[PDB]
Structure formats: structure tokens, C-alpha cells
Amino acid sequence: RPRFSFSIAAREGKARTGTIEMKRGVIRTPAFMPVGTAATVKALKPETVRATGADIILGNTYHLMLRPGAERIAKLGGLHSFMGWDRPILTDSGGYQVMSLTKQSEEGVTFHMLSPERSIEIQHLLGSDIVMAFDECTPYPATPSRAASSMERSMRWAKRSRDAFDSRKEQAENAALFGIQQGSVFENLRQQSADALAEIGFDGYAVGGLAVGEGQDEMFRVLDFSVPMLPDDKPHYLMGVGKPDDIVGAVERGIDMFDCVLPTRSGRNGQAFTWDGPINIRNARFSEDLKPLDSECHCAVCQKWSRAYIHHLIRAGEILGAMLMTEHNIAFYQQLMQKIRDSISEGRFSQFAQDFRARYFA
Amino acid sequence: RPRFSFSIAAREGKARTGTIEMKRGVIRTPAFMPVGTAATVKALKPETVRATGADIILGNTYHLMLRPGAERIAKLGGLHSFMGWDRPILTDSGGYQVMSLTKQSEEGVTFHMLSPERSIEIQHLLGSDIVMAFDECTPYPATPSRAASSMERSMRWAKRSRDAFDSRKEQAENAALFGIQQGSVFENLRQQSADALAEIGFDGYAVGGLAVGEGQDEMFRVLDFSVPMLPDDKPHYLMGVGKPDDIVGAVERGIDMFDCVLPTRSGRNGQAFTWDGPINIRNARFSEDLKPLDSECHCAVCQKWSRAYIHHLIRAGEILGAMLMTEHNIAFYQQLMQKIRDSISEGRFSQFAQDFRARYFA
Numbered sequence: 085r086p087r088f089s090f091s092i093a094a095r096e097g098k099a100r101t102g103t104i105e106m107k108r109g110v111i112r113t114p115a116f117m118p119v120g121t122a123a124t125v126k127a128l129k130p131e132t133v134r135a136t137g138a139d140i141i142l143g144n145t146y147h148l149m150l151r152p153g154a155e156r157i158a159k160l161g162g163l164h165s166f167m168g169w170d171r172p173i174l175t176d177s178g179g180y181q182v183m184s185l186t187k188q189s190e191e192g193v194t195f196h197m198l199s200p201e202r203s204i205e206i207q208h209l210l211g212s213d214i215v216m217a218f219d220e221c222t223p224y225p226a227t228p229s230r231a232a233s234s235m236e237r238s239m240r241w242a243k244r245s246r247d248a249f250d251s252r253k254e255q256a257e258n259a260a261l262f263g264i265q266q267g268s269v270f271e272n273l274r275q276q277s278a279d280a281l282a283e284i285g286f287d288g289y290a291v292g293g294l295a296v297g298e299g300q301d302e303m304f305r306v307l308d309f310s311v312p313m314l315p316d317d318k319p320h321y322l323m324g325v326g327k328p329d330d331i332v333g334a335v336e337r338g339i340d341m342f343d344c345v346l347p348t349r350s351g352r353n354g355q356a357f358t359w360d361g362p363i364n365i366r367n368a369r370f371s372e373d374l375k376p377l378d379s380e381c382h383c384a385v386c387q388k389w390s391r392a393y394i395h396h397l398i399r400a401g402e403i404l405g406a407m408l409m410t411e412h413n414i415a416f417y418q419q420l421m422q423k424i425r426d427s428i429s430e431g432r433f434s435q436f437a438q439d440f441r442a443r444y445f446a
Numbered sequence: 447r448p449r450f451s452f453s454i455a456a457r458e459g460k461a462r463t464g465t466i467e468m469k470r471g472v473i474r475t476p477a478f479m480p481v482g483t484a485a486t487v488k489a490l491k492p493e494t495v496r497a498t499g500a501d502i503i504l505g506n507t508y509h510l511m512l513r514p515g516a517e518r519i520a521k522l523g524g525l526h527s528f529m530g531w532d533r534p535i536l537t538d539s540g541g542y543q544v545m546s547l548t549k550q551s552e553e554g555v556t557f558h559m560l561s562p563e564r565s566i567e568i569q570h571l572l573g574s575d576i577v578m579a580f581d582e583c584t585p586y587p588a589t590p591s592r593a594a595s596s597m598e599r600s601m602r603w604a605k606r607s608r609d610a611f612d613s614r615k616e617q618a619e620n621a622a623l624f625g626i627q628q629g630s631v632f633e634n635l636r637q638q639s640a641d642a643l644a645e646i647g648f649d650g651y652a653v654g655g656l657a658v659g660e661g662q663d664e665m666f667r668v669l670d671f672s673v674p675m676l677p678d679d680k681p682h683y684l685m686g687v688g689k690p691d692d693i694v695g696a697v698e699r700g701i702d703m704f705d706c707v708l709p710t711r712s713g714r715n716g717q718a719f720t721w722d723g724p725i726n727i728r729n730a731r732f733s734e735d736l737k738p739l740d741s742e743c744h745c746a747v748c749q750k751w752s753r754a755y756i757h758h759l760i761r762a763g764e765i766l767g768a769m770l771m772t773e774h775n776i777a778f779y780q781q782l783m784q785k786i787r788d789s790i791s792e793g794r795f796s797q798f799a800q801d802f803r804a805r806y807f808a
């Protein structure tokens with residue numbers, strides 16, 4: 085079992101499909117990572133997360149470093165053992181969220197003090213498989229001079245992340261490290277950032293600082309020039325994205341990995357994803373609808389329960405409502421990724437994207 | 447498959463163990479019925495309820511008759527289809543809860559008007575397997591004259607329940623009807639009530655009007671003379687009871703069936719049942735405890751996750767916390783019932799009760 089091996093099996097335009105082999109399992113790409121806020125993917129057992137097709141989850145670090153604490157989780161055997169997920173876990177670096185949810189210096193972020201060295205050690209203690217570099221959160225909007233300052237600090241922090249990771253033998257031998265490109269919406273800064281990260285060298289490269297309110301057109305415009313700046317032979321990870329159409333468009337532009345809270349969070353709020361677009365199951369029109377949430381979905385929820393029942397559960401505030409909506413939405417996201425992988429493999433992803441959009445927005 | 451066949455396989459003192467065969471499945475007795483408030487056993491899929499060992503669940507009618515409504519549930523295919531539980535369901539009659547949570551007349555309860563005929567029709571529409579007679583809620587405490595009035599109205603309502611049930615062919619042929627003994631804490635009224643119910647004739651007999659604040663000593667004193675008043679050859683159902691020690695003591699006094707919200711409700715509130723007594727998992731003493739909730743429990747929760755993890759989930763307000771606590775508590779209740787059945791079968795229930803109490807209250 086390799087530490088980290090990315091292999092591209094097929095291409096179509098800028099889109100790629102393939103695999104990342106790691107010690108704890110294989111990740112099929114393009115990949116969607118369910119988000120686990122506080123050592124749980126909300127309302128799902130890990131076996132259910134796996135049953136939906138997920139190969140890897142994202143563990144939020146910002147929450148866990150406070151309570152229970154990274155040292156405590158390590159004492160209890162690590163995050164995998166703690167939460168009962170034995171496959172790869174990507175951990176975010178914590179500083180971004182802290183600033184997003186503070187006082188910044190060259191040393192790190194104060195809120196307690198979080199430094200790039202401390203971030204890597206926390207992720208080490210959690211037993212992370214994919215470690216993110218410690219980066220800074222750029223405000224949006226931001227002046228070129230302001231985005232440049234943040235990006236450059238992030239690049240210096242990326243070097244320190246690299247060194248801290250490399251100094252930890254167990255981590256360097258068993259885990260992978262991703263750098264995070266910054267530079268807001270500006271092409272020249274995205275280039276300098278890419279250049280800096282490539283000079284350092286990482287196992288994978290994330291596009292950070294997007295989905296911060298710029299809108300899809302702008303996000304896509306930024307991806308258009310930003311993704312080709314990254315090393316072609318390494319995975320490309322778009323952080324915090326997104327809606328199904330965001331994902332399809334991002335894959336068309338060379339992205340291999342995704343995470344976002346939308347399927348879980350909007351699931352609990354009554355929004356279900358379908359191939360004909362999102363529906364809100366609380367709507368009165370579903371009160372006697374015996375069809376499943378989606379007519380084609382292969383998930384366990386759509387095999388057994390009706391829209392009418394789930395409508396009732398969510399309106400009654402029942403936990404099982406949240407459970408069923410969440411399992412379906414995560415499964416829908418995984419079936420989307422599977423359709424993306426198959427269509428790229430088969431050289432018909434362009435047609436899939438067109439067919440998908442025509443029906444989803446009909 | 448029989449409509450309703452109760453067979454006693456073994457006795458020990460007043461305790462009995464055996465089976466109720468019904469069209470939708472076999473019920474092992476003594477039986478515990480998880481409570482499903484609004485067409486869900488809170489935080490559990492039906493498959494998980496079954497996995498814990500439950501043979502039958504209780505469906506609360508008071509909630510369902512309002513929303514979604516009994517007619518609507520019938521239009522959608524019945525309660526079994528609606529919620530995805532294909533085994534027996536006992537439905538309560540609704541009037542008791544309405545008064546407990548009103549204006550009473552000979553016709554029924556106004557809050558809308560709920561009559562014994564309407565109650566049976568509602569339970570018919572839900573597709574109930576065990577239909578409860580429509581009874582009145584006696585206040586506690588209550589004067590002999592006051593408990594007598596309520597009990598007598600309940601007995602007249604029991605006759606009307608019987609007639610409404612018998613007039614519905616599909617119901618009479620496929621379902622069972624239980625009468626409910628009332629009479630508060632008074633022996634002579636319990637006798638008159640038993641006599642009245644026996645004169646009418648039912649498939650099973652419930653002891654109603656207990657666990658209303660009288661305390662365990664008094665409840666047991668009432669059961670002491672009340673249960674022998676019921677037909678020996680029919681099941682005895684103690685409604686709304688209870689804590690594990692309540693159950694053991696009630697079986698010692700001839701009870702065959704139980705329901706209560708304690709394992710589900712107190713599960714969500716952080717209380718876990720163990721053979722060494724209840725624990726509150728939120729307590730700081732569990733924060734680094736790697737043991738399962740209970741050292742012997744065979745449930746899926748205790749096979750995989752630690753006290754420390756569940757402590758974290760409940761303190762974080764995570765849905766998975768409620769899910770895991772609830773599955774364990776329901777499983778614990780079922781393992782309790784299994785131990786009760788086996789020990790009666792083997793003629794060592796007296797010793798089991800003593801051993802159970804010595805350890806549970808140690």
C-alpha cells in the first residue's frame with residue numbers, strides 16, 4: 085500500500101479521472117469528501133457514509149483542537165479510531181476557519197495562538213492522512229495589494245508547513261501534504277502563489293480562497309486561469325465547493341477533489357438534491373407524494389421511504405428526518421461523482437455536463 | 447399465520463414466558479415495545495429497531511390523528527408502509543393522552559371530538575395490529591368515588607370499543623383488541639373493572655392508570671392484587687412502564703408486555719442504561735473512557751464506539767450522539783427482556799431478579 089500515488093486513467097479536455105492510493109484506502113477522482121465538523125458526518129454512522137460511496141472524509145480541525153483537543157484525541161487512539169472511520173481523512177489546517185469565524189502576525193493566528201508548526205502537529209496528533217498547509221484567510225473583496233500580502237504570508241507559512249511535516253518521520257512516511265494556492269481573484273497573484281507552492285513541492289495542490297461570495301461566473305473565470313498554473317501530474321483540490329453545478333463546471337476546468345457542507349447542512353434544513361434540481365421536502369406539494377426523493381437514485385432512502393413520509397418527519401422536527409435527508413443527499417453527491425468519473429473515462433463527459441445542466445435547471 | 451394466538455411456554459411463580467403469534471409476526475413475552483411518537487421510533491431506522499431485538503412497536507395515535515391524519519396515512523398505504531415497519535404495531539387509543547396532555551362527556555373526549563367509535567376507526571385506518579380500547583384518564587390522586595366514575599365510563603367505552611371493532615370485518619379478522627383495566631389504586635374498583643372487561647371479552651388485558659406518580663412500592667402493591675384479577679390465559683400489558691427494575695418487578699407479578707419512552711427519551715438526554723445502573727454520559731468522568739457504554743452489552747454501539755466518543759457527541763449536541771445512545775438503550779432493554787424470558791424458561795427467574803437488583807443498585 086503506497087503512501088500517496090496519484091494516477092490519471094483518462095482525460096477529456098481539462099477534465100481528468102483516476103485514483104489516489106493511500107495506506108488507508110483508494111480515493112476515486114474526481115472525489116467528493118463529506119465534511120465532518122466535530123468528528124462526525126452529521127446524522128450518519130461512518131458505515132452509512134461509506135455505503136453512500138465516499139472514499140474519504142474531511143475532518144474539521146478548528147472544532148476538534150478546542151474540544152476534545154488534539155492531544156486528547158491522540159491519547160484515545162487517533163481520529164480514525166475515535167469516530168470509527170478507518171479510511172482516509174483529510175484535515176483542514178484550522179487557521180482559515182478561525183479567521184473566517186482574530187489577530188494575525190508572522191508567527192501565526194491568535195484567537196490561543198495557532199501557528200503553521202502547531203497546525204501540522206495538531207493534524208499529526210489527529211492521525212490525518214492528507215494534511216493541509218496552514219494558510220491565511222483573505223477577505224473578499226480585497227485590493228490587489230491586500231490579497232498579495234495575505235497570499236505571500238500564506239506562501240511563507242506553506243514553507244513552514246512543509247518543514248514541520250518533513251521533520252515528523254511518522255507523518256512524512258504515512259501521510260501526504262497539500263499546499264493551498266491563494267491570491268484572491270487576481271491572475272498574477274495566483275501565478276506567484278502557484279510558483280511558490282511548486283518550488284516548495286507538495287503531494288497535491290488546493291485552490292483556496294474561492295466560494296467566498298464571488299459568484300459562479302467569477303469563480304469559474306478564476307479557475308480558468310488558476311488550475312492550469314498547478315502541476316498537471318498532481319491532484320487539484322477546490323476547497324469548500326459546492327453545489328452540483330459548481331462541481332461539474334469545476335471538473336470541466338481540471339479539479340479532482342471537492343468538499344462542502346451543503347449536502348449535510350441543507351439536508352437537515354429540508355433541501356433534497358435530485359436530477360431535476362433541488363426540492364424542499366417541507367413544501368405542501370409533497371405531503372401525499374409516494375415517490376422517492378429522486379426517481380433514479382440508488383440510495384437506501386429512495387429504495388424504502390416516500391417523499392410523503394420524509395415531508396412528515398422534517399415538518400415534525402424528527403431526527404430520522406435529518407438522517408434520511410442527509411444519507412440521500414450524500415449518496416446523490418456520490419452518484420454525481422460516479423457519473424462524472426464514468427463519463428470522463430468513456431470520453432463523453434462534455435455531453436454529460438450538457439445533459440446534466442439541461443435537466444437539472446429545467 | 448394466526449390472527450392472535452397467545453401460548454405460555456413456562457411459568458415461575460406469577461411470571462410467565464411465551465409467544466403471541468400474529469399475522470405480521472411473533473411477539474416473544476415478556477415483551478418490551480419501543481414507543482414511536484410520530485410514526486418514528488426517535489433517531490432509529492426501523493431496521494435498527496428490529497436489530498435491537500424488538501418484535502413489536504407502539505404507535506402513538508394522538509399525534510398521528512392530527513398530522514398527518516389517519517385518513518391521509520390510510521391513503522398512503524397504512525402506518526406500516528408509511529414508516530417502513532412491517533411487523534406488529536400496537537396503537538394506543540388516543541383519549542388517555544389527550545386528557546393527560548379537555549371536556550369529557552358520555553359521547554367521548556372533546557379537545558375536535560374523540561369517541562370510542564372514532565378511536566377504533568382511526569386505529570383501523572392506521573392499520574394497527576393490536577388495537578387498544580378507548581379509555582379515560584383518571585387523575586392521580588383521586589377519591590374512590592372519582593376513580594369509580596372514570597372507571598365505569600371507561601368500562602362503558604370498552605363495550606363500545608368492542609362493538610365498533612367487531613363491526614369492522616377486516617379489523618376483526620386481522621387485528622386484536624385489548625381492554626384496559628382502570629380503577630386507580632383501589633382494589634374493589636380494579637375488581638369491578640376486571641369483571642366488566644372479562645364479561646365483554648378481549649384478546650388481551652392492559653393494566654392502565656399506573657405510573658402516574660404513585661411510586662414503585664404502591665404500583666407494585668396495586669399490581670399484587672390487580673393482575674390476578676385478569677384472565678390468566680390472556681396477555682397482561684402494563685401501560686407506560688418503565689424503568690428496568692419496574693419491569694423486573696412487574697414480570698414477577700404477572701405482566702407480559704411493556705412500553706415506555708424512557709430508553710429513547712433519556713437516551714437523547716445522555717442517560718445510558720447499564721447492568722451496573724444508569725450512567726450520564728455527559729459526566730466529565732467519561733471524557734477519556736475507552737470502554738463501551740456497558741461491558742457486556744451485545745449491541746452494535748458497544749461493539750464499536752467508546753464512552754469517550756459518545757460523551758463528546760452528546761456534549762457537542764450531535765445527532766449521532768442521540769442515535770447511538772438510543773440504539774444502545776433500546777438494545778439494553780431488549781437484552782433485559784431476553785434475560786427475563788430465558789430465566790423464566792429455565793426456572794431461575796427469582797435468582798435472576800435478585801442478581802439483577804444487587805448489581806444494578808450497587
Ligand SMILES: Nc1nc2c([C@@H]3N[C@H](CO)C[C@H]3O)c[nH]c2c(=O)[nH]1
Nearest residue numbers: 176177180292293323324343344345
Ligand atoms: N485552509 C483552508 N480551508 C478552506 C475551506 C474549508 N472548506 C470547508 C467547507 O466550506 C470549510 C473549511 O474547512 C474553504 N476554503 C479554504 C481555504 O482557502 N483554506
Ligand SMILES: Nc1nc2c([C@@H]3N[C@H](CO)C[C@H]3O)c[nH]c2c(=O)[nH]1
Nearest residue numbers: 538539542654655685686705706707
Ligand atoms: N390508553 C391508555 N394509554 C396509556 C399510556 C400510554 N403509554 C405511553 C408511554 O407512557 C403513553 C401512552 O400512550 C399510559 N397509561 C395509559 C392508560 O391508562 N391508557
Ligand SMILES: [Zn+2]
Nearest residue numbers: 381383386412
Ligand atoms: Zn436517494
Ligand SMILES: [Zn+2]
Nearest residue numbers: 743745748774
Ligand atoms: Zn450497547
